[PDB]
Design a protein around this ligand. Structure first.
Ligand code: CLA
Ligand code: CLA
Ligand code: CLA
Ligand code: CLA
Ligand code: CLA
Ligand code: CLA
Ligand code: CLA
Ligand code: CLA
Ligand SMILES: CC(/C=C/C=C(C)/C=C/[C@@]12O[C@]1(C)C[C@@H](O)CC2(C)C)=C\C=C\C=C(C)\C=C\C=C(C)\C=C\[C@@]12O[C@]1(C)C[C@@H](O)CC2(C)C
Ligand SMILES: CC(/C=C/C=C(C)/C=C/[C@@]12O[C@]1(C)C[C@@H](O)CC2(C)C)=C\C=C\C=C(C)\C=C\C=C(C)\C=C\[C@@]12O[C@]1(C)C[C@@H](O)CC2(C)C
Lengths: 230, 227, 213
């Protein structure tokens, strides 16, 4: 009926195709429970959106400021607002917005109302897709755009994971590593940097130091799952 | 199923000649499960076709360039000039991905028969499927089928069984006497009593290991003896 | 009919094909009594889950020590941990026993009284601690993803996989112990020594396992 992740497989009984991006992929059956599926839907949406913003951010940061490594961009900004003032502002603002989102996740009819200016509120929406003031100028049909969102978001999740694992192995940014691959397509793969056989294991060493200073402390900067690296 | 593999044997009641090259052999009873019989026919076709390609490749590679050992042709320093000392990692990547695609497609044709026939990009093009293992269409472009299909399947599977035996023969000869197929044949014809499987079995000419761009491939022989 | 540990041998009557990993293996008839069999089922599951965690941890830390990261072997990690970090081993042990005693007494008194532990006495948590089956607590805390909920055939397949990987991990931890006692080195050091020379490097060539030669 609908396009599936495996063009010959049968989707699980709990994936009927109603959701955007529903391609019948749940081999572990994590979304079998109807209550867990709502939470995983919201987590997929926010992971997608965070990862899309983050991938676009790294790319545009690499283009505008190639002077700075995105993996090191946390300890190289030197803003006048210090580390902890920024951390406090971020903590409280993100706490507010994420607790609001969480309260919409639990009891959906709860939080559409502005807590200051009562005249403004969101229309009755679906969980994960607030709408209202969050969505001016929706260009076209909403279903196809939800599908587009979740597809670009899955791609961007994999893209951020790739940024991480190509910045730990190569030590270079996304476009820098892309040019590294284009300048040597057959030698700069992960297959051409690494190989395990029954008798030896060659893993790529990390280009990220194990610790960095950042103002009088030593932040542990570990490779993600080195050792399990091929 | 007629004219079985032995004069006095009976065919098992699941081998009745509906498959090509059915001599009713199955002495281990592995095809008693029909699921397993389907899967084993597919694996038989895969081993057969890959072994026909393999014997063809070893033979034509020894005939075109006898300068190169087929047992050592996989080494990157023995590769042709456009590919000599190529990075085996990127090569293995090309192969891994391009074969994962096609073999997963074939496997999904095994699981759900007739579900991966259509092209997934240009959805106007459908490979047919008379049988599982015989796609046809773009895989049968000359159109030798839509004729005697059972007889051609029989020819295919017979030559494929022979090619499997012949390639394992090539491999074991290369491990024993250190020579290719035709080199071993000419070495037999040079002295057909002092150069045969006697005085050559028991000695494995394969090294204990081979360094390939940093890796050490363990490089075993199919039987023990003399390094 | 059903796969048995000893093909041909009929399974015992008390081992119906209902529990996960039921292969009719009870030569000593230890679980012949039903309540004792429930107790031993939960014991097998706890042993196997602790052994899965232990095999995974030993394997991961051995991988890390083998590739060169800052890891001791599993037989040296306790000392290294309590001496690198100035940790008092008595304090750590009594904290561990306090917490595990709370948890395991809750276990025990849900086994004795399955209806218990769900009254809201702990912190008001009622349904997070009621238990689905014996040895399979479930709920939003022990089964946060809801994998027991929803698909039931998937749940049975997962029970089988759990008990079987648990038995395999118990065998694996017994193997780690015996391999340390014999070869005196790590598990993946043993594996690399075996992959180097599969012949001439095995349990038959330690002089410990087979004392004949
Ligand atoms: C954490 C991010 C995240 C989350 C929560 C979800 C959640 C969901 N996905 Mg999505 N998905 C994601 C990332 C995510 N996805 C990515 C990155 C891809 C591209 C590979 C997809 C591709 C995809 C498809 C094609 C489909 C779904 C579907 C679903 C739904 C059913 C599956 C389920 O319940 O599992 C819940 C999932 C989790 C709880 C996350 C698993 C975390 C485990 C513990 C670790 C996994 C490690 C992972 C393998 C490492 C990968 C990294 C790298 C090697 C690539 C559910 C709403 C189906 C759907 O829409 O049905 C409604 C569907 O057809 N997903
Ligand atoms: C995923 C979010 C994210 C995060 C955490 C970062 C983090 C960072 N970026 Mg990147 N960036 C992102 C997305 C992100 N970026 C995107 C999407 C773009 C494309 C527009 C960029 C383009 C970009 C450039 C061009 C540069 C950075 C730089 C930086 C660094 C300093 C930022 C700073 O001084 O704050 C400044 C803070 C502000 C100007 C205030 C925020 C702007 C207003 C208030 C809008 C915020 C609300 C709005 C609704 C969006 C929120 C939704 C969504 C992001 C969740 C820091 C490492 C700099 C760098 O390289 O540092 C070394 C740098 O030069 N970023
Ligand atoms: C602080 C801190 C520091 C400095 C380290 C340091 C280390 N960890 Mg991490 N780790 C920590 C806390 C910390 N751990 C915590 C709190 C958890 C939980 C983990 C979970 C964790 C995993 C799961 C793994 C590491 C591993 C490692 C080692 C290799 C680096 C890597 O991740 O690959 C390295 C010694 C890896 C080891 O290599 C086998 C690894 O696989 N750590
Ligand atoms: C003795 C060898 C042999 C024989 C008799 C056949 C015979 C057949 N094959 Mg098989 N095949 C072979 C080798 C062989 N093939 C090998 C080595 C491969 C791997 C490349 C394949 C891959 C293959 C596929 C993928 C398909 C076939 C198909 C067919 C059928 C039509 C083509 C035909 O008759 O070609 C006869 C060939 C020759 C006369 C030339 C052989 C010598 C050369 C130089 C027929 C049953 C198609 C089919 O049955 O679809 C209906 C189909 O889909 N074969
Ligand atoms: C039951 C049959 C049998 C068995 C078990 C062996 C066993 C063995 N043979 Mg013998 N061999 C056999 C029949 C057999 N051979 C026959 C029929 C011929 C002819 C040979 C010719 C032969 C040679 C030429 C050599 C062996 C060698 C060996 C040893 C390594 C191979 C091994 C002990 C090798 C060895 O170590 O001596 C060796 O060099 N075998
Ligand atoms: C302590 C761990 C432990 C426990 C409590 C159980 C408990 C159980 N198993 Mg499991 N099992 C285990 C480990 C364990 N098993 C391991 C490691 C394997 C793989 C070898 C298996 C393989 C297995 C199969 C294949 C089957 C069972 C079955 C059963 C059930 C019926 C038998 C019975 O009453 O045993 C009671 C067991 C004990 C009271 C513990 C035994 C302790 C003895 C007294 C000491 C000797 C153990 C050993 C020989 C010594 C080795 C170590 C030593 C050198 C130090 C019961 C739920 C059957 C079933 O239906 O399960 C649902 C079944 O078919 N088990
Ligand atoms: C092969 C291992 C395995 C498998 C198949 C299961 C399967 C199951 N468990 Mg068991 N369990 C295990 C290991 C396993 N468990 C271990 C090691 C522990 C101890 C922490 C537990 C503790 C436990 C409890 C307390 C409960 C279950 C429950 C369940 C059921 C629902 C969850 C589920 O579907 O799991 C599916 C499992 C997987 C898909 C495996 C995931 C693969 C992991 C992530 C690999 C990586 C491991 C990593 C290296 C180390 C993890 C560290 C850990 C602390 C997180 C199901 C029968 C619940 C139940 O029966 O509900 C009614 C329940 O209450 N299990
Ligand atoms: C989880 C399974 C497992 C695996 C994969 C390995 C793998 C390995 N072991 Mg270890 N080992 C295991 C379990 C395992 N072992 C157990 C359970 C023991 C205790 C008996 C040992 C004791 C041991 C020693 C003393 C040595 C090894 C060594 C080795 C290496 C070479 C193999 C060898 O010498 O034969 C060992 C193979 C076995 C003991 C058989 C595997 C386990 C069987 C199948 C368990 C069967 C249990 C049975 C179903 C129920 C029992 C009850 C029944 C009696 C009624 C290799 C890396 C050697 C080494 O270090 O290499 C350099 C070595 O010296 N092993
Ligand atoms: C696939 C195959 C070979 C493929 C070879 C290839 C790709 C070769 C490639 C290369 O060489 C070249 C071209 C050039 C080189 O420079 C590079 C390499 C890469 C090296 C061989 C299979 C070879 C397969 C063989 C020999 C299989 C034999 C199976 C038998 C006898 C089964 C028998 C039974 O199962 C039944 C039938 C019934 C049961 O009841 C009883 C028993 C008896 C068990
Ligand atoms: C082998 C085993 C049990 C075997 C039982 C068997 C065969 C039972 C057989 C029978 O009863 C039946 C079935 C039926 C009866 O009719 C017949 C018999 C025959 C009687 C249990 C292992 C059980 C093994 C377990 C629970 C292992 C847990 C391991 C852990 C926690 C490891 C922790 C650490 O290693 C790390 C992770 C890091 C280190 O630095 C720190 C430490 C702490 C050392």
């Amino acid at each position: 009926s609908r396009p599936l992740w495996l063009p010959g497989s049968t989707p699980p009984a709990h994936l009927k195709g109603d959701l955007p991006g529903d391609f019948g992929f749940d081999p572990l059956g994590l979304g079998a429970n109807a209550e867990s599926l709502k939470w995983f839907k919201e987590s997929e949406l926010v992971h997608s959106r965070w990862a899309m913003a983050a991938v676009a951010g790294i790319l545009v940061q690499e283009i505008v400021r190639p002077d700075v490594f995105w993996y090191n961009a946390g300890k190289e900004v030197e803003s006048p607002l210090g580390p902890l003032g920024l951390l406090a502002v971020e903590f409280f603002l993100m706490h507010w917005v994420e607790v609001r989102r969480w309260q919409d996740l639990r009891k959906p009819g709860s939080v559409d109302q502005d807590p200051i200016f009562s005249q403004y509120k969101l229309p009755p929406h679906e969980v994960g897709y607030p709408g209202g003031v969050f969505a001016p100028f929706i260009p076209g049909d909403l279903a196809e755009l939800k599908v587009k969102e979740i597809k670009n978001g899955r791609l961007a999740m994999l893209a951020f994971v790739g940024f991480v694992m190509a910045a730990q192995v190569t030590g270079k940014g996304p476009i820098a590593a892309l040019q590294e691959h284009l300048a040597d397509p057959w030698g700069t793969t992960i297959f051409s940097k690494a190989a395990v056989v029954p008798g030896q294991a060659v893993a790529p060493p990390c280009k990220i130091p194990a610790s960095v200073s950042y103002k009088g402390i030593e932040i542990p900067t570990p490779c993600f799952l080195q050792g399990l690296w091929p | 199923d007629r004219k079985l593999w032995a004069p006095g044997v009976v065919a098992p009641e699941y081998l009745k000649g509906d498959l090509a090259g059915d001599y009713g052999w199955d002495p281990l009873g592995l095809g008693a499960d029909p699921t397993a019989l389907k899967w084993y026919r597919q694996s038989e076709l895969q081993h057969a076709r890959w072994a026909m390609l393999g014997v063809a490749g070893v033979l034509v590679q020894e005939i075109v360039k006898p300068d190169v050992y087929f047992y050592e042709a996989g080494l990157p320093q023995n590769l042709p000039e456009p590919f000599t000392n190529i990075n085996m990692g990127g090569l293995l990547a090309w192969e891994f991905i391009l074969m994962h695609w096609v073999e997963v497609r074939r496997w999904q044709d095994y699981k759900n028969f007739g579900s991966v026939n259509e092209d997934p990009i240009f959805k106007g093009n459908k490979v047919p499927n008379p049988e599982m293992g015989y796609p046809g269409g773009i895989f049968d472009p000359f159109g030798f089928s839509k004729g005697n299909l059972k007889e051609l399947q029989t020819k295919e599977i017979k030559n494929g069984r022979l090619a499997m035996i012949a390639y394992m023969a090539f491999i074991l000869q290369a491990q024993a006497t250190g020579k290719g197929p035709l080199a071993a044949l000419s070495a037999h014809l040079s002295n057909p009593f002092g150069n045969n499987i006697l005085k050559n079995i028991g000695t494995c000419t394969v090294p204990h290991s081979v360094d390939v761009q940093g890796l050490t491939i363990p490089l075993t022989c199919l039987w023990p003896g003399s390094q | 009919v059903r796969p048995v540990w000893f093909p041909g041998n009929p399974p015992p009557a008390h081992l119906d094909g209902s529990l996960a990993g039921d292969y009719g293996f009870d030569p000593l008839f230890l679980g012949q009594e039903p309540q004792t069999l429930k107790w031993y089922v939960q014991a097998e599951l706890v042993h196997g889950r602790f052994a899965m965690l232990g095999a995974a941890g030993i394997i991961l830390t051995s991988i890390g020590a083998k590739v060169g990261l800052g890891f001791p072997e599993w037989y040296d990690a306790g000392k290294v941990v309590v001496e690198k970090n100035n940790i008092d081993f008595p304090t750590l042990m009594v904290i561990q026993f306090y917490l595990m005693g709370w948890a395991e007494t809750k276990r025990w008194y849900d086994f004795k009284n399955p209806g218990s532990q769900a009254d809201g006495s702990f912190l008001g948590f009622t349904e997070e601690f009621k238990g689905l089956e014996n040895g399979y607590p479930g709920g939003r805390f022990f089964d946060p993803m809801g994998l027991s909920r929803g698909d039931a055939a998937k749940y049975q397949e997962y029970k089988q996989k759990e008990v079987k990987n648990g038995r395999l991990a118990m065998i694996a931890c017994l193997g780690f112990a015996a391999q340390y006692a014999a070869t005196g080195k790590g598990p993946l050091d043993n594996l690399a020594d075996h992959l180097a020379d599969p012949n001439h490097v095995n349990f038959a060539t330690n002089g410990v396992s087979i004392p004949i030669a």
